[PDB]
Amino acid sequence: YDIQAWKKQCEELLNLIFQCEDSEPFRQPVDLLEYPDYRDIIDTPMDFATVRETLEAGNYESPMELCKDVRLIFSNSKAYTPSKRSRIYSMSLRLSAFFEEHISSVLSDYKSALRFHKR
């Protein structure tokens, strides 16, 4: 029932994401020189270094907030892709499936710890 355990669990999950090849297009903010119309379609850019830095700065209060920002990386990729068969969008779908598979226990354990605290 460790209320703070989600933080290190999220740091480890971000390490796994950074290690895999599929994360390369999403590790740093999108390069507007590579994609000049990016901010005409995407309102809020997000990338894994910004998520990691926000976590390390102590600027997430819960794993749900981290999960919302990681989900925004994937929804931005889906909104920007000209095709659902594109290379970069295909990488985002694989990364999203891996992320969701692992974040589920982080969220469940955190919410369980809070309930135990408020029992």
Binding site for ligand YI6 (CB under 6 A): 16, 20, 22, 25-26, 30, 35, 77, 80-82, 86-89, 94-95, 98
**Nearer CB in complex with ligand YI6: 42/113:** 42
Residue type at position 114: L
Quick one: 35 or 116, whose CB is closer to ligand YI6?
A: 35
- Output the smallest distance, CB 26 to ligand YI6, in A: 5
Shorter beta-carbon distance to ligand YI6: residue 16 or 49: 16
Rounded Cα distance between 92 and 88, Å, is 6
Minimum CB separation from ligand YI6 for residue 110, in Å?
Answer: 21
Q: Which is nearer to ligand YI6, 71 or 112 (CB)?
A: 71
8 Å CB contact between 95 and 26: yes
Distances 48 to 35, 66, 67, 82, 113 between C-alpha atoms, Å? 18, 10, 11, 22, 26
- Specify the 3-state DSSP secondary structure of 81: coil
**Shortest reach from residue 87's CB to ligand YI6, in Å:** 6
CB of 114 to ligand YI6, least distance (A): 28
Residue 93, Cβ density class (10 Å: 0-12 exposed, 13-18 middle, ≥19 buried): middle
